[PDB]
Structures are given as structure tokens and as C-alpha cells.
Design a protein around this motif. Structure first.
Motif, PDB file in Angstrom:
ATOM      1  N   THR A 261      -6.441   6.611  -4.147  1.00  0.00           N
ATOM      2  CA  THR A 261      -6.225   5.174  -3.942  1.00  0.00           C
ATOM      3  C   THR A 261      -7.392   4.626  -3.148  1.00  0.00           C
ATOM      4  O   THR A 261      -8.119   5.389  -2.512  1.00  0.00           O
ATOM      5  CB  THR A 261      -4.926   4.897  -3.136  1.00  0.00           C
TER       6      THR A 261
ATOM      7  N   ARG B 233      -7.207   2.687  -0.476  1.00  0.00           N
ATOM      8  CA  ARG B 233      -6.854   2.753   0.945  1.00  0.00           C
ATOM      9  C   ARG B 233      -7.157   4.106   1.579  1.00  0.00           C
ATOM     10  O   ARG B 233      -7.515   4.172   2.758  1.00  0.00           O
ATOM     11  CB  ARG B 233      -5.370   2.409   1.150  1.00  0.00           C
ATOM     12  N   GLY B 234      -6.974   5.182   0.810  1.00  0.00           N
ATOM     13  CA  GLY B 234      -7.303   6.531   1.274  1.00  0.00           C
ATOM     14  C   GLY B 234      -8.778   6.873   1.098  1.00  0.00           C
ATOM     15  O   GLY B 234      -9.363   7.595   1.921  1.00  0.00           O
TER      16      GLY B 234
ATOM     17  N   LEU C 146      -8.890   5.982  12.170  1.00  0.00           N
ATOM     18  CA  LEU C 146      -7.754   5.587  11.344  1.00  0.00           C
ATOM     19  C   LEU C 146      -6.617   5.044  12.193  1.00  0.00           C
ATOM     20  O   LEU C 146      -6.564   5.272  13.407  1.00  0.00           O
ATOM     21  CB  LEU C 146      -7.280   6.800  10.532  1.00  0.00           C
TER      22      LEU C 146
ATOM     23  N   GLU D 192      -1.464   2.877   9.543  1.00  0.00           N
ATOM     24  CA  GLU D 192      -1.394   2.204   8.261  1.00  0.00           C
ATOM     25  C   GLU D 192      -1.991   3.087   7.160  1.00  0.00           C
ATOM     26  O   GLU D 192      -1.481   3.105   6.036  1.00  0.00           O
ATOM     27  CB  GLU D 192      -2.176   0.872   8.380  1.00  0.00           C
ATOM     28  N   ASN D 193      -3.063   3.818   7.479  1.00  0.00           N
ATOM     29  CA  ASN D 193      -3.824   4.517   6.436  1.00  0.00           C
ATOM     30  C   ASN D 193      -4.002   6.025   6.606  1.00  0.00           C
ATOM     31  O   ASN D 193      -4.481   6.684   5.685  1.00  0.00           O
ATOM     32  CB  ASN D 193      -5.192   3.828   6.182  1.00  0.00           C
TER      33      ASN D 193
ATOM     34  N   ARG E 143      -2.046   8.607   6.546  1.00  0.00           N
ATOM     35  CA  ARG E 143      -1.367   9.445   5.592  1.00  0.00           C
ATOM     36  C   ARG E 143      -2.158   9.451   4.291  1.00  0.00           C
ATOM     37  O   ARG E 143      -2.462  10.519   3.747  1.00  0.00           O
ATOM     38  CB  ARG E 143       0.068   8.947   5.350  1.00  0.00           C
ATOM     39  N   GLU E 144      -2.482   8.255   3.799  1.00  0.00           N
ATOM     40  CA  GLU E 144      -3.224   8.125   2.538  1.00  0.00           C
ATOM     41  C   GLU E 144      -4.608   8.750   2.586  1.00  0.00           C
ATOM     42  O   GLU E 144      -5.015   9.385   1.627  1.00  0.00           O
ATOM     43  CB  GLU E 144      -3.298   6.677   2.047  1.00  0.00           C
ATOM     44  N   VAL E 145      -5.321   8.585   3.700  1.00  0.00           N
ATOM     45  CA  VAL E 145      -6.614   9.210   3.840  1.00  0.00           C
ATOM     46  C   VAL E 145      -6.486  10.725   3.745  1.00  0.00           C
ATOM     47  O   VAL E 145      -7.206  11.344   2.979  1.00  0.00           O
ATOM     48  CB  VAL E 145      -7.373   8.786   5.140  1.00  0.00           C
TER      49      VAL E 145
ATOM     50  N   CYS F 146      -5.651  11.770   0.217  1.00  0.00           N
ATOM     51  CA  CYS F 146      -6.840  11.601  -0.602  1.00  0.00           C
ATOM     52  C   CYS F 146      -7.777  12.783  -0.402  1.00  0.00           C
ATOM     53  O   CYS F 146      -8.304  13.330  -1.371  1.00  0.00           O
ATOM     54  CB  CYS F 146      -7.557  10.295  -0.235  1.00  0.00           C
TER      55      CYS F 146
ATOM     56  N   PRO G 207      -6.979  -4.541  11.010  1.00  0.00           N
ATOM     57  CA  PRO G 207      -6.077  -3.399  10.828  1.00  0.00           C
ATOM     58  C   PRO G 207      -4.625  -3.675  11.269  1.00  0.00           C
ATOM     59  O   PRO G 207      -4.316  -4.719  11.880  1.00  0.00           O
ATOM     60  CB  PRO G 207      -6.713  -2.291  11.687  1.00  0.00           C
TER      61      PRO G 207
END
Lengths: 121, 125
Positions: free
Chosen positions: A75, A77-78, A93, A96-97, A99-101, A104, B2
Motif C-alpha cells: 500500500t 501508506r506502508g 512513524l 497511524e502507519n 503497522r502498515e509499514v 509492507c 500526521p
């Protein structure tokens, strides 16, 4: 006959700052990655330096204006912070992000980029 | 901006070095390179983005070159003896010189306006 040696402590970081600046202005880049419908300019050589995943993804490619689409698992975001990490050596980080990072990074097969790498400001 | 404090940090102290080793490796294998430099009739494969980041002369010769196959002829000021260690510097952060080639390399570094040599022991005259 003896040898004079200089090892630069700043050179690598300055090179990387230069390359990141180029990325941000889209100067001297060579590949467009499409990640969940977003365009990201980069240097294939920098990407392939960081990961086997990008190595296999980008080595053969012989095209004017190369364009590589990443699969749905990746994604924007990641990926965004991971691209910026390849150009800075830094990940910063939030809730918000993170987990996705991390998710990824596991898909892009980055060894041991986990929870426990992170610290608090 | 953010959501949440962007307070979760990781800084890698090996990352840069690792990138530069990968780049130097790419250079020596001639894989993922993009420009061919001709210097005193010798060929050197490199990355235009890397040259542009290390050298003002290369920055200004190379910005706006969008073409895939790129060959760049350097002028007669640039000898293979003086450039060799500089290209290697660019790719490793290390410059090794002796009495035999120092003047030639230093002179070549001024012409190229190579960066990140100011913290060195070498005078530029």
C-alpha cells in the motif's frame, strides 16, 4: 613510497542527501513505481541496493521511462516511509502507519524490520 | 499532518554504508549502471545520479540528461590516473594516494569539484 589515506565520515550521508533531494525534485531518477495508484519516482540502483526484492524487480528492464507496478499487498501508506528510509537511513512513524509499514517491509522481504527495531524519541 | 505523535523511531547506522557497497558492487559488475564515462580513451561504467551527487562538474553536465544509453566524454584535463581514485572515492568514501599520483589526483579533484574532501589531510593548491 608510503600511502596517504583518507576515510570520509560524511561522504556516504552527503551522497544520500543528494540522491534524496533528486528524488524529491524528480531530477535524474529512472523508474516510476506505481503503488496503490500513486506514482513514486526513484533510482532503481538505490532500490536494488537495499533489497533483493527490488533487484529481481529491476535488473533486466531496458525501457525509456520504466514503470513498475507493485502488487496489491504493497500500500502507499506502508511503502512511502520505506522508500524514504532507503534514502535517509531513518524511519519515523506514528500509531497511524507503523503497522502498515512493518507489514509492507515483510512483503518486500526486508530482513528483521520488526516491532523491536523501534525506539522512542 | 500526521495522526499521533511520530515518535516511533529507527535510525540505521549501517544503512548508508550498505547502500554505497551495493552501488560500488553494481558499478564493478556493470549491472544497474546507466552512464559510460570516457576518460583518456578508457571506459568507466557508473550511475549519473551518484556522479551528480558527489561532483559539481558532473551535476551540471548531467542534470537534464533523460536518455537511457548515455556516453560522456570528459575533456583532456581529466586523465585516467587522476580520475580512477576519485571515482573510487565517490563509491566508497575512501581515497588512497601516494607521492606518485597525488598531484594528478588533486588537480583532477579541483576540476571536477569533488565534494567531501575538505575534512581530509590533503591541501588543494
Amino acid at each position: 613510497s608510503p600511502m596517504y589515506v583518507y576515510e570520509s565520515t560524511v561522504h556516504c550521508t552527503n551522497i544520500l542527501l543528494g540522491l534524496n533531494d533528486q528524488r524529491k525534485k524528480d531530477i535524474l531518477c529512472d523508474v516510476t513505481l506505481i503503488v496503490e495508484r500513486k506514482e513514486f519516482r526513484a533510482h532503481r540502483a538505490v532500490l536494488a541496493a537495499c533489497s533483493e526484492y527490488f533487484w529481481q524487480a529491476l535488473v533486466g528492464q531496458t525501457k525509456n521511462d520504466l514503470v513498475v507496478s507493485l502488487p496489491e499487498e504493497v500500500t502507499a501508506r506502508g511503502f512511502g516511509p520505506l522508500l524514504q528510509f532507503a534514502y535517509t537511513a531513518k524511519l519515523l512513524l506514528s500509531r497511524e502507519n507503523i503497522r502498515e509499514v512493518i507489514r509492507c517491509a515483510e512483503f518486500l522481504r526486508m530482513h528483521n524490520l520488526e516491532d523491536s527495531c523501534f525506539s522512542f524519541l
